[PDB]
Every structure is written in C-alpha cells, then in structure tokens.
Amino acid sequence: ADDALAALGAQLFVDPALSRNATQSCATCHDPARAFTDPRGDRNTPTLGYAALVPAFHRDANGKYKGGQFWDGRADDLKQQAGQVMLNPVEMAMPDRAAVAARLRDDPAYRTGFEALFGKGVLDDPERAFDAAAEALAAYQATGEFSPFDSKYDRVMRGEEKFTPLEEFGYTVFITWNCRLCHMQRKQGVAERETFTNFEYHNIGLPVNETAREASGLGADHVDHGLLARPGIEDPAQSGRFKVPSLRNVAVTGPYMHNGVFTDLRTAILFYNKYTSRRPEAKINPETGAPWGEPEVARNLSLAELQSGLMLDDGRVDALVAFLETLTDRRYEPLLE
Amino acid sequence: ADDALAALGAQLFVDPALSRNATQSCATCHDPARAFTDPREGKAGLAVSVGDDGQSHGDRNTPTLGYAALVPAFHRDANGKYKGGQFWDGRADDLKQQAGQVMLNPVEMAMPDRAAVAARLRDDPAYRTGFEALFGKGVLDDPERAFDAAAEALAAYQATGEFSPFDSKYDRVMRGEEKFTPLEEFGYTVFITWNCRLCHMQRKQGVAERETFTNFEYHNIGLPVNETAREASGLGADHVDHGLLARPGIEDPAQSGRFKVPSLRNVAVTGPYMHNGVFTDLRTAILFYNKYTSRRPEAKINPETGAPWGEPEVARNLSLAELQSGLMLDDGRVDALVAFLETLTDRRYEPLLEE
Amino acid sequence: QETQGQAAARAAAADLAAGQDDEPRILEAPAPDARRVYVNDPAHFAAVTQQFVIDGEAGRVIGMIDGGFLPNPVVADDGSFIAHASTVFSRIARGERTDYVEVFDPVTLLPTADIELPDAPRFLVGTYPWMTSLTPDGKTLLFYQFSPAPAVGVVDLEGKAFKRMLDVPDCYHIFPTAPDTFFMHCRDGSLAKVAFGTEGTPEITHTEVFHPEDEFLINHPAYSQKAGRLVWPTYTGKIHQIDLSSGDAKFLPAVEALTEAERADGWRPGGWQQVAYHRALDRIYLLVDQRDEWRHKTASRFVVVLDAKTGERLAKFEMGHEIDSINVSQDEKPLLYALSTGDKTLYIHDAESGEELRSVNQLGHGPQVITTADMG
Amino acid sequence: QETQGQAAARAAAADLAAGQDDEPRILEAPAPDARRVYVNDPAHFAAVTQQFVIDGEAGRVIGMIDGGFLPNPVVADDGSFIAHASTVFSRIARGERTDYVEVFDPVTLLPTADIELPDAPRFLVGTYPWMTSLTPDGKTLLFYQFSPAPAVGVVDLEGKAFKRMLDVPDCYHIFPTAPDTFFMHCRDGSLAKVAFGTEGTPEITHTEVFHPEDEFLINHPAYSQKAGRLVWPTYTGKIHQIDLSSGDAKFLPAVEALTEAERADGWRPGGWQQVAYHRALDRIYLLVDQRDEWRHKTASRFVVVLDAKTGERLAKFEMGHEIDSINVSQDEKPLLYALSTGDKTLYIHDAESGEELRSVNQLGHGPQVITTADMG
Amino acid sequence: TDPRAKWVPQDNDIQACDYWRHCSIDGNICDCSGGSLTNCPPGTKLATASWVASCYNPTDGQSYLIAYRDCCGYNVSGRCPCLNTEGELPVYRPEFANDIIWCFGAEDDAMTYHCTISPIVGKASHHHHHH
Amino acid sequence: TDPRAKWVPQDNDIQACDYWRHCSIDGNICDCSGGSLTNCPPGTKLATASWVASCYNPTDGQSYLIAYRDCCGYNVSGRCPCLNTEGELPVYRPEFANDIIWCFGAEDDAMTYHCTISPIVGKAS
Numbered sequence A: 001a002d003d004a005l006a007a008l009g010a011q012l013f014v015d016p017a018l019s020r021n022a023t024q025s026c027a028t029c030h031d032p033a034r035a036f037t038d039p040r041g042d043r044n045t046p047t048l049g050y051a052a053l054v055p056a057f058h059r060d061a062n063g064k065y066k067g068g069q070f071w072d073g074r075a076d077d078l079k080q081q082a083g084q085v086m087l088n089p090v091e092m093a094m095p096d097r098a099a100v101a102a103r104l105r106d107d108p109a110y111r112t113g114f115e116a117l118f119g120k121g122v123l124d125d126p127e128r129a130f131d132a133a134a135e136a137l138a139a140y141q142a143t144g145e146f147s148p149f150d151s152k153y154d155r156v157m158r159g160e161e162k163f164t165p166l167e168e169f170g171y172t173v174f175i176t177w178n179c180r181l182c183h184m185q186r187k188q189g190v191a192e193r194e195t196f197t198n199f200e201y202h203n204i205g206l207p208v209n210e211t212a213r214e215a216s217g218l219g220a221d222h223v224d225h226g227l228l229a230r231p232g233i234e235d236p237a238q239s240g241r242f243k244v245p246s247l248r249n250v251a252v253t254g255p256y257m258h259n260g261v262f263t264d265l266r267t268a269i270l271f272y273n274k275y276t277s278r279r280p281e282a283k284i285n286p287e288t289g290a291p292w293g294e295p296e297v298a299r300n301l302s303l304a305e306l307q308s309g310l311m312l313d314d315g316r317v318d319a320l321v322a323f324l325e326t327l328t329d330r331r332y333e334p335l336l337e
Numbered sequence B: 001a002d003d004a005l006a007a008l009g010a011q012l013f014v015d016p017a018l019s020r021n022a023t024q025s026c027a028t029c030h031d032p033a034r035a036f037t038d039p040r041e042g043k044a045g046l047a048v049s050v051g052d053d054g055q056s057h058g059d060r061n062t063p064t065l066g067y068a069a070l071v072p073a074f075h076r077d078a079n080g081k082y083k084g085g086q087f088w089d090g091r092a093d094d095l096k097q098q099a100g101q102v103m104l105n106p107v108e109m110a111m112p113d114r115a116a117v118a119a120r121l122r123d124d125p126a127y128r129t130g131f132e133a134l135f136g137k138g139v140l141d142d143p144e145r146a147f148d149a150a151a152e153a154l155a156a157y158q159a160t161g162e163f164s165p166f167d168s169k170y171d172r173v174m175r176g177e178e179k180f181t182p183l184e185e186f187g188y189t190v191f192i193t194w195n196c197r198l199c200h201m202q203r204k205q206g207v208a209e210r211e212t213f214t215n216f217e218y219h220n221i222g223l224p225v226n227e228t229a230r231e232a233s234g235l236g237a238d239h240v241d242h243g244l245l246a247r248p249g250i251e252d253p254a255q256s257g258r259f260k261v262p263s264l265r266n267v268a269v270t271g272p273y274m275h276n277g278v279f280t281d282l283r284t285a286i287l288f289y290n291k292y293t294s295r296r297p298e299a300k301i302n303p304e305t306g307a308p309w310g311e312p313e314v315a316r317n318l319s320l321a322e323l324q325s326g327l328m329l330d331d332g333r334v335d336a337l338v339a340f341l342e343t344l345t346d347r348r349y350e351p352l353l354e355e
Numbered sequence C, D: 001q002e003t004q005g006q007a008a009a010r011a012a013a014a015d016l017a018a019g020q021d022d023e024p025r026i027l028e029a030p031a032p033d034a035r036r037v038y039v040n041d042p043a044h045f046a047a048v049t050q051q052f053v054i055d056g057e058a059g060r061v062i063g064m065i066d067g068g069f070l071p072n073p074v075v076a077d078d079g080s081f082i083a084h085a086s087t088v089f090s091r092i093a094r095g096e097r098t099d100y101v102e103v104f105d106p107v108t109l110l111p112t113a114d115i116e117l118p119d120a121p122r123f124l125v126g127t128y129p130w131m132t133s134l135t136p137d138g139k140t141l142l143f144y145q146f147s148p149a150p151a152v153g154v155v156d157l158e159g160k161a162f163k164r165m166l167d168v169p170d171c172y173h174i175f176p177t178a179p180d181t182f183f184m185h186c187r188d189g190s191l192a193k194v195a196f197g198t199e200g201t202p203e204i205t206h207t208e209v210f211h212p213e214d215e216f217l218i219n220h221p222a223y224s225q226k227a228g229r230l231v232w233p234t235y236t237g238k239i240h241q242i243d244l245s246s247g248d249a250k251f252l253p254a255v256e257a258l259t260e261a262e263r264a265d266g267w268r269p270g271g272w273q274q275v276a277y278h279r280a281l282d283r284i285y286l287l288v289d290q291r292d293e294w295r296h297k298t299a300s301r302f303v304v305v306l307d308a309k310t311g312e313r314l315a316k317f318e319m320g321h322e323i324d325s326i327n328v329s330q331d332e333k334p335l336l337y338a339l340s341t342g343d344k345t346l347y348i349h350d351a352e353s354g355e356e357l358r359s360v361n362q363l364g365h366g367p368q369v370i371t372t373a374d375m376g
Numbered sequence E: 001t002d003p004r005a006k007w008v009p010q011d012n013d014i015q016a017c018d019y020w021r022h023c024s025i026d027g028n029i030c031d032c033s034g035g036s037l038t039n040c041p042p043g044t045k046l047a048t049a050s051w052v053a054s055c056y057n058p059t060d061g062q063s064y065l066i067a068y069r070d071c072c073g074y075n076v077s078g079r080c081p082c083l084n085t086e087g088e089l090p091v092y093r094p095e096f097a098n099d100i101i102w103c104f105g106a107e108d109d110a111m112t113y114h115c116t117i118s119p120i121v122g123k124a125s126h127h128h129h130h131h
Numbered sequence F: 001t002d003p004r005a006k007w008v009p010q011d012n013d014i015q016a017c018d019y020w021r022h023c024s025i026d027g028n029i030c031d032c033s034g035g036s037l038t039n040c041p042p043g044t045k046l047a048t049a050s051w052v053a054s055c056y057n058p059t060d061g062q063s064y065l066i067a068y069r070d071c072c073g074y075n076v077s078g079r080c081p082c083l084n085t086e087g088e089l090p091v092y093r094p095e096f097a098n099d100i101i102w103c104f105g106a107e108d109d110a111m112t113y114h115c116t117i118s119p120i121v122g123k124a125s
Ligand code: HEC
Pocket: A013, A018, A024, A025, A026, A027, A028, A029, A030, A041, A043, A044, A045, A046, A047, A048, A051, A068, A069, A070, A071, A072, A078, A081, A082, A085, A086, A090, A091, A092, A137
C-alpha cells in the first residue's frame, strides 16, 4: 500500500486528464528536470522538492503561524493542497470533484489502481475518488525521490567531502548573518533533515512584479495579502506575509520570491541589503537599474530581523551564492553554471 | 626708643590739637570705650562719622583700631591678589601712612598741610622734648620730618598690646583655660567648615600664631549703597565707592568694588557693619551671606528693613566662587555663629555684650 | 549538592541528546516572592552602579538593574514594583547633571516610568535606605535633599510626575506612615511628623527629644512600614523603638543588644546596615563585634538576635565572614541575609539556627545595601 | 628607597613645622615629555572607563581622564594634545547613544574640544590603537566604522567638526601617512592606500597581496608615524615590515621573531599589544611565551628584542609577571613598558637590560592599552 | 589554571570558563546574571548578530557550531568573566573574531555589552580549525 | 590590618590609610591620582564645602582640625581607597559626617566624587 499508493500518485502526477481541458499535468508546471518547477497566474511556481518536510499548518504557542502549503499557506498540508490545485481556476481548473472522478473512471488503469487501494466502486463516489487522488498525489511527493538529501551540503555534513574556501565562507556568513533567523528549521540544535526554512510567514517588503501582475489579469488594483488570504485567517498582522521557502535547489529554481520578481539568485541576495546598507547602490535593483519599488504591503514588515545593522559586501554576496549552490540535489548539479 | 615712641603716640592719639579747629582727636572717632570705634550719632546714625568742622560726614564706617597692627603692609602677592594695607580700600600702605592721610583729610581732622601740624607740635613743650629725644634737635622745625615723626609715633602706639590683647573668650578657650558652651562650639565648627573660613582666617592651611579672622585680602561681597550715609556724605547719587580701585596706583578694573576683609575680633561690639555701616545688627550681617545660597524668599530680604537687600553698589568682581557655597545657614547655625563671634570680644569689652 | 551550573549542564546535555529545540529569548524573572532579595552596589562612589536581584531560596541571580551615581533603591512591600532615584551626567562624571526616578516592572525589569527631578535635587550620600522611601500605598516616593537646606521632594509615581519640595526643619531620613505623612529625625533629637498637601506649608510637629546630643543614632535604622515600627540602634547597641502605627509616635522601652559585660569588653555594633527587624516574629538582629569606639563602619562577624518586646537575647550567631549589612526575609521561617562589601558576596543563612545555607558572589565592586519586600 | 608617599609626608611635616602656608588648588600635570606614558583601562567592557596619565621616570600617576564605553585614545607625537573618541548613553548603558571626540590640554587635562559624531558611528570593539588615528600634522582624527560596513570617519580637530564618512573596501585599521592619506589592511591580504579630498569618494589603491589567507595578522601591529614604519606580526611571530615613508608601501624583508626550534617547542607571541617598535634604534620588541596555538590573547612572560634591518635577535627578557601589553618610550635609553591586565599594574623596565625599575598599580579594572608620544 | 595550556573542554558546569560551548566566548556567561545557557537576562536585548566557533563536545566527540549572541543594553555583568579563543581569527575575519561587540540587531539599538549566550546552530568545523 | 582595632596614626607616608591626617577620610587619597596631600588632581574641581575631624599628629602630640575637601567632577579614582571614622558622627551632625559627598561649591557645579585632600585648618578646641 505504501509503494502502491505512491506509484498511483506518480501516474496522476503526469496525467493531463486532471486538467480542465486535458492540457497540463502537475509535471507541466513542476518539471522533474528542473527541480519540480516551471522551465517555460500571479505567483511564481514553487519547487515540490522537500515540500513533504513542511509541517501541517498551525498556530504555534507564541501566536506565529507555521507550515502549510502554497505561498500563503491556504492549504493545511500536501493532500489538501492537491485537492485545491486540481480545482483552482489558475492551476488545473477542474470544474468540480465529479469531473475529476469521471476522468479517473475513464481510465482502466485507474479503476484497477484506485480500487486496489481504496475499495471497489471508489471511482463512482466523487468525494471519495477526489480525496483518494489527492492522497495518492501527496504520497508520491513524500517519496525519497522528492527529498533525497544528496546535495553537496549533505555530503559535507556527513563528512564525505569538504566545502571549498568560498563555500565554507558562504556557509559561515549564512549561519551568522540574519539569513539563519528565517532559513533554518530550528532556533538552535541541529536539524536531522534541514531544509533551510523555519516554515514561518514573513513580509520582507517585496515590490509588485509589474509585468507578472499585468499578465495575471488580476487587475492593477489587486494587492496580494499573502497569509491573510487563507480562509479563517483574519488577523491583520498577517497581511503581506508569505511562507519562508526552503532554499534547497534554490540555485536552479529562478526566478525568485512569491511573484518571480528577481530573475537572478544574486539579485535576491542583494535585495536584503536594502534594509542594512547606506550605499546609494543598495537602493537599486541591478536587474533594472531602478529603485527596488515600494512594498506591495507596507505593514507587518519583519524589520527586527531585516534591519540587522550589517551590509553584505560583494565578497560575502559571492560567498552566499557559492554556499546556496551546494544545496542543489545531486541530479541537478549539471544545471549549475 | 620702642616704649618711648609708643608713649609719644599715646599722647598724640588723644590730642585734639591734631585737628584744624581742635575739636577732635583720634580718640573722638576711635573711642577706647567702644573697641576704638565712633559712638556718636550723626545724620546717618552710627554708620559714618563727623569731622572736625562739625558738618562733614564720611562715606565709610569708622573701623576698630584693635588688631590693625597685625595687618601686613600693602602688597600684590604672586597670585596677583592684593593684601594688607590700611583703610577699607587699602589706600594707605601701613599704619604710618594711614596716620598722615587722616590728619590732612578735610572730611576728618582737616589739618591744612604739614606745616600746620608742625606748628601745633611746636606749641607744646612736652612735644618739643618728646620728639627731640627720639628724632633729634630741630625735628619740629622741619614740617616734613615733624609730620612723619608724628605718624610714626601714632603707628607705634597702635602696635602696643593694649590694642591687640588676645584675651577674648576664644583666646582663653584655645589656651585651654575655659571651654566653649555647646552653642559657641557649634558656632566655631560651622565657622571653620563653612565659607566664612575662606576669607575670615589668616591662613589658607596650617595654624595662625595670632589669628585675627581675616586673610587681609580684598573682596567684593556685593553690598548695596547705604542710602542715608551716602546722603550724609554728600558724594552724590551718581557716586560709586570703587573700594580698592580708588587706591592711587591701582588701575585694574577687576579691583573695583573690593574692600579689605575686616578682622572679626570685637565684631559683636563694633556695629553697625560693613564698609558703609549699612547693617545695624550682627545677625543681619551674617544673614546677608544667605542671599548667595538660600532659595527661600526671605533670604533676599534685609530683616532690618523688610525690603530687598538692594542691587550691589558694584555689580562686577563679586567673590561668587566663595559666596555661592551651595549651603544655606539655618536659624540654629546663625545663632551658633553669633555666639561664636561674641567669643571674639576682648575681655574689657564683655560688659558691652549685655546691651 | 549539585550546583546550579552543574544542573544546567546536565539539562542542556539532555536537551542536546534528545534534539529538544528552544528559542533564544529574554527571560522573565520568576514572580517576586518573600525570598527575593535585592543587593545594591554603590561601588565605592563610582559614577555608575548596579543592583542584583536574587532568588534567596536558590541562591541565584535572577536579574540586574543599572543605576547612576549613589542611587536610592526602594521595593514596594506588596511585590508590585521596584524603583530608584538616580543621578547621571552628560560626560560620565562631569557636565550636565540629571536626577530622575525610574520605576521597574519586577518580572521584566523594564522601566515603566522615568521621571525627571528638576534642579538636580537629590542628596548624594553613601547609600541610606530611608533617605528615599515609598508611602504605604506605593503611590508616592519621597526623597531627601540636603542642599541648600534639608527638604523632602514629593514624586507622584501614579501620575509619573515630580510634585514639589517641602521645607522641613533641620532633620534627616524619611519614614512614611500614610499617603501624606512621614516622620524624620531631627538634629535636636526629636522626631518631626510632617503632614503635607499638594500646596501649602506642611504641618510639622515634633515629639519630645528622645536622645541627648552625645548618644549617636546610626545612619541605618530598620523601619517596618507595615508594623509602623522604627528600630534605631546607637553606636553602643542601645536600641530605640518607636511605634508610629497609630499615626503619632508612641515610644517603647529602650533595650540593650549587648550585655554590660560585653560592652566593657569592647563589643559594639558596626558595619553599614547594622540592624534588621522581622515583623511577624517581632525580632531584632544586630551586627556586632569587638571593636574600638570609632571603628563603627567596619565589618562585623556576629549577629545577636533579640525579642523586641522584652530585649531578651534569643541567639548570637558566628557568621563566619566579614559582614557589613544584614536584613531578613519577612516570611515564616525567615532567611538572614549577610552581605560582605569586601568579599562582594551575599551569604544566606537560616535565621533560626544561624547556619550558612548558600552564597552568591561577584556582586559588583562594593555591595552595601540589602532590600526585601514584606509581602505578608 | 624613600617612596613618593614618604617624601610627601616629610615635606608636609616640614611645611607645618615651618608655618609655610600654601593655597589648596588644582594642580597642573608636569609638561609632557618622552617618558610620559598613558594607560587605558577598557575595564572588561564596562560602560565607563579611565585613562591613567603616568610619569614613567618617577612611576607616578600624574592625572586621569574619564571615558565612556570602549573609547579610543590618541596622543599627539609632539606633546601638544591628547584626544579620544568615546561613547555615552543617556541611562548608563541604555537609551540614546552619543559618540564624540574630546581633545584635552595635556597639562590641565581640561577638554578643549567636544565634537559630537553624528549617527553614533564608532566601532565598538576591545581596544585597538590603530582603529582611531591622528594625521601627522594633528589637525585630523580618523576613526574606523564597522556597521553597516567598513568606513572611516574624518574629524577636523582644527575646525572642531565632524566632516564626513569615507567609503572603503573590506579593510581594517587606519595608518595615516599624510594630511590626506592613510593605509588600511584588507581581508584579501593587501593594504589599501586611501587618499581623501574635501569632497568626493577617496582615491583607493591596493598593494600586492603580502600574506596568504592562512597567515593571521594580529589586531595590534605597531606603527611609527614619524618613521612610516608598520610592524605587523602574525600568530607565529613572523613579522611583516611595511615602509610607508615614500608615501607608498614598500614591503621590507620578512623577519622571524622566534627560531624554527623555538616554534617547534611551542613558542608563539600572545597577549594584547604584543609588539613595540623603537624608531631611533630601529628595533622590534615582541611578547612571547610557550603556548597552545589558540591561546593567543593570554599574557606572556617574555619579550624578545630584534634588529628590524637584519632580524638578528638582540635580547630575550624574562619579564617576571604575566604581561599583556608592551610599548616603549622613544627617547634615547628607552623604557620598556609592560602592562598586566590581571594585576592592573604597569611594570616599567630598562629596555636595554630588561630589568624592572618600578611599577604603578591600581590601574583600574582591566587595563590593556599603553600609548607614548614620539617627541624627538 | 595554566592560562597558556591547550584548553580542555568539559561538559559538567556551564558557569565555568572551560565549559565546552564557551570555546570562543569573550565577556561574561549569561547564566550568571539571570539569563541561561541560551537566553538573555531580563531587561537586556538579544542581538541578532553573531560570531561563530566550532567547539568540540568531549561528551559525544562531535564538533558543534556555537553562534554566540550578546545580550545588550546593560553595563557588563561582572559575573563569570571568560575569554577563550579556540579558532579565533583577527578582526579582518570578523565571522570568527571575538573582540567585537556583537550587539547589532538588538532591540532599541542596544549596543553595550552585558553577557553572551552559547547556543548550538550546527554540527560542523572549519578549514582553519577542526578537531 | 585588624580592621576593628583602634586606629593608629603615622606621620611617615601620606599614601597609606593610617597617615595621621586621614583620620576621617572616606574615599580615596588625592595624592594617588595626580593631586597632592592638599591639592586636587588636574581636571578635577575643588569643593569649598568641608567636613572636619580632630586628628592627632604623632609627630608633635598636637590634635589638629583637618577640614577635608573633596575633588570633584571625575569618577572615583580607584587608587588608595581608605575609610576612617575617628570622631565621625551620623548624618544629622553633618559637620562631622563623612558619607556625604562634600562637593558643594566646586566649580562648574561638579558633584561626583574623585578623591579627598587633607589640609589642616586649626588646632582642636
Ligand atoms: C499551471 C501551473 C501549475 C500546475 C499544473 C500545478 N501547479 Fe502546483 N503550483 C503552482 C503555483 C503558481 C503554485 C503557488 C500558488 C500559490 O501559492 O497560490 C503552486 C504550488 C504547489 C505546492 C505548494 C508548495 C509550497 O512550497 O508552497 C504544491 C505541493 C503543489 N503546487 C503541487 C502540485 C500538484 C500535486 C499538481 C498536480 C495536481 C500541481 N501542483 C499542479 C503551479 C501549478
């Protein structure tokens, strides 16, 4: 049932029959050749790699939200996410659960596969069929293939090899500068399966991505409120906050941030200097030669963490890039420059 | 010489032939019954004295002669502070020069010139004998020598023990003959720990052999004009008594308004107080110093008048470093200082303390 | 047996082996309780100073408070806050002086008020606890001024504002008994009762003179505001007790902390906070030793404990260190605190047996003043 | 044999017996000379600190200067003034921060300038002499800033005004060589020459890289501004000498303060100010001891003396105490100053024989920095 | 006691200067002024800046990254003073340097030094300093 | 050495706590920070206020009044600390009390304690 459930999810994952007009599968936007992101909507498509390590969405005892799926956490976990994305008009866009069940019923392999795991006639019950498909998709993403922990960083932490001087400097910067306040699992101690995110929600004051927003059709009067958009969240302190992404594979999953606003990994690193540096250049996005832009949501910024008092000089930017490239899974190392 | 010269001075000191109309001697204004000060009521009370012409009033209060012989000759010390001399403004270098100045001053003894003084000395057979034995035959025919000799004799007389007996209760107590009352002892401790000691003790540190409760310096403590005395003196509403700057030869504007720190010996019996006789009562002179330290409204009010003390006559060069001590004398400490200053009264003047 | 440092190592090691995570953060002090004790370090007149907040049960520093030049600490008896009157200058020890009162939350230690006192009015003196004092309701702080004359400053902690200076006679120390009344000790040997309003000359009355000029009352009497009991030793260990709990001073019989034989053999109190008073047991504790008559500020090695009502000696403890100040917790089976200025160590003893239980070292440069709350 | 305190007692007794009066007053320090030495006490990171002014010939404290948190002292080589950049806060160690430069008259010790530095721009670090530096004409003080990035502030001592901050690369320390030029040491192993105007980004030029990334250059090199000589030891006692006298860096031949045999037997430099240089003798002094490679900040008990031109060892002195910092006077027959942080004492040695002549104790809480003027 | 001897870590007392996580501490141990091994005392401000050392833990034979953080905004505690410098590099390699007052990022711009905490942030070592 | 023993004056070293003029000093001896027995160190301000003690001089068997004065406006010197209390009375007899910071009258309103000088002002009586 473990292997079998995941194997069913693997077949679903590449099947365009789960899309409104049979045009795209999960693999369309999450290409395994590109760390399960889009090699070719208002938000950037995130990697599926290591998404299975994220806890279910919850409010912790200090009142911080953590975990969940989607950039705004609107899904509790992978199973709930799969159901949402199959029905979401901006992704798979299936009109309803009965339509999904009907596509499944049309395929003799799915009758066999789903009945063996969930019982005879499961595909005749739209709620049970849809829930089973979401569960199989979640199981598939929870396999080792999606989270293999075989990057250079992994090998170095196992003592199998060593960082280069530049990578070791980048590692030391990462763990002593503000990056570790958000892009490490734990506050202290050593994580067993580190994915370079504390699963929290933070507004880092990103500007709108003009061209993506234009193309989304959402209208220029649209504002993306991040976590506040999750149904049931009403707390106005959550407005503009987004889930901290895992930095695993980050070197190969550009463009960056929730809206794809920066094309280059170095730009994403330099953005943090806008909070710390007094140089005129720290104000300028190097990809455009113009000021970064005012925050899309000008409240709830994580100023305590971001206004660290220290600017990254170019050498430390080079070092962080080198360190972030060591978090690339083995099968993606050929993609590095 | 020594005894004989002082004895000649004793005779001169009481001789009204040294005044133009022969109405007054040194002893008229410096009455031995009143610690050598002037008991006579004039147009300004006891604040200022009346001269030989019976009309002219001085603009300053007649000081005691007791202990004036312990004052050093006038000089500038190496720190640029002036010290010593005679008169409230130091305009006489020493007692001998002071004596000549007062004999010729038209506001006081009013002798017209040295020859006139020599003429009076020549009229008296005892003076012919006394001066000739000390200064030589024919001294009284030379007005310069006669006059200088007379001033020298008067200075010598003031340097005798009678004028500086050191027999006050204070001196008795320091010799271990008696004890202070607890109130006197508290007054003494306050005097030596509060700012009074910075001006009214001979030395800055160490112990004086013959303390006279003055360091002989010149300070402006910011006193107002005594208006009834200033009216009596006739010097005018626009007059400013510049204190030490009025000494000939002193030209430094920083000396304006500074007067010689008086010895406090016999202070309890020599009121009224200050260089212009402005305060009748000893307690009022002590309370004056609280105007620099107390924040209470009453501290700016002269208790004798019920009005503000008054603008200083000279607002520049005040000794603020010493005066603005940060600490106010409460009534207990004022009582104590009065008791202590009363102990500086020579034995022969103790009966004056009753009144 | 295991020290705090050892127990903490054992716990962090257990956390590490178990993979337990915790967030680095700012701790809260534990809730004020009867066994909390504060030690102030005037640091031998340094321009800046420190207070240590100590759990007397565990013998653990649980927090600190910085202060300026010779600040006066106070601690509300009910545990609700602590405060001090303090003084700073614009260039360390020179330049513009600012005197101020800070009020602190007793768990976060954050200042909840900072109240400027106009015209730099604090009396700067080696620290005497009853030179700055809270009223019983905790709403007002009263502080002493010496220059230009004795005066008492009134600070409204509730409204967070300086109110006024009161003129007083030539008197010293401030023992509040009500929201608007306190007592002082006067140079003439009486106490003065001062009842004051927002404006107006305060009403001042004096007791009879209760000691002559050659009997010397120490700068550190004990005062229990909740009992209204003022316990005032002299240099020889004679102890005056004054009951202010009715609002007017009633005098109790004077007692002797030392026997006639001990005084003949040179026993005298000495130190800084030489006396403590436990209110529920109605017991007095006095630091004493054999000493010359003018070595009255030296440390002592003994504490005598006496019944306040009868003067009967209940114990004489050999403290085993050079002790400058003592105080007690005001709970049932109290701790006796014994602070060494030279060792910079608070020794915490069982007050019944005198036994040293534990100690807290490295308390600044010259710690001198112990304060506890009477929460009962 | 007769100590300063005994000689003073005799003089006071003679004045009393003679009836000599004298006015209590504020003394002037004796004129600054080659043998004056300054000791700065960072007091183990206390919020307020002290500098001691000492007559090295008599071994006497002749004055003191108060400072704030981790101040940087500088001493004009010609004796005409001293200065520091210092930091205070409005409530001891909390509240609004003010950083400022004070210039002092070297005989009355009165501040003759107090120049605020905007936006609290100093680098707060355990004290390194060459993190704040005077230009050779004394008109300009340069100080290092670390946050948000390496930078150097320009303070005009003549006009008494902060001027501006200079952007620099990833470099450390400030060695001025001209009214408008200084050098810094860069992370990449080069020195940067920085030449600055009234206005404009400075002109910055790097030297060749002169040491590899695993050769570690200590925080306390010696620099003689009058010689243009930068003397820079590494953790192993290899010594870089850089000649700045032409206005550009010329790298002199490397010299080893320790032999290969000594290094294999564990000898390494260690302490705080580990290195001194005498300009007239062209001589290098280094504090060294046997120590593990990561005990480089512990005290050392030996000094080696070497000829700067040949590297030849001239002497090896057993200092007799745990010494953290050294320096020398710059006159002929120099003194060798050996400061112990732990003992709070400056030991004053004959530099030629190395023998201890005298010492000055009670130098605050953790004294660490010695500064002398090069007046010849 | 021999201050120049190779430092010998222990895992039995966090208030002592040879406790294994203090291998590059400079200042005062927070646990001695009302903090704990990894928390600041009340009234102080926890800096976000840090310095790091790879400290060998004798208990388990592993080397852990300790990213020291200062607690700031109070005068130095004066209790449990310690200075160790295992793998400590000069100021131009500031990620390893421990004379710097690492109070950046502390609330209220606190920048005075009170004490330091010793939290673990990783299990690694460095080229210049490995067990 | 025994702190509780009767204090024993000497007239041979002014930097020691048993020097005869220090009989009621509280703080630090100015001679140890660049002052002298009776002068303040540079940079400090001489108070005009004083406290007094009668101190016995073993050189001449005379008791003299020492009118202590503080030097003010600097943090406490930390060198030669001493505290003696011969004849010292509590704060309500302030003229003999020595825990008070007697910096009144110092120039520039200086009120922090640096050290104390020990000048004679008279013979005791
Ligand atoms: C048309 C492109 C597209 C298709 C097809 C698509 N996705 Fe996504 N995926 C996205 C975008 C865009 C987001 C982020 C959307 C947001 O945050 O609102 C997303 C987010 C997710 C996430 C959240 C990961 C995280 O870190 O937040 C998961 C898991 C996910 N996709 C899985 C799936 C699965 C399983 C399928 C097939 C059922 C699927 N995707 C189909 C574009 C797509």
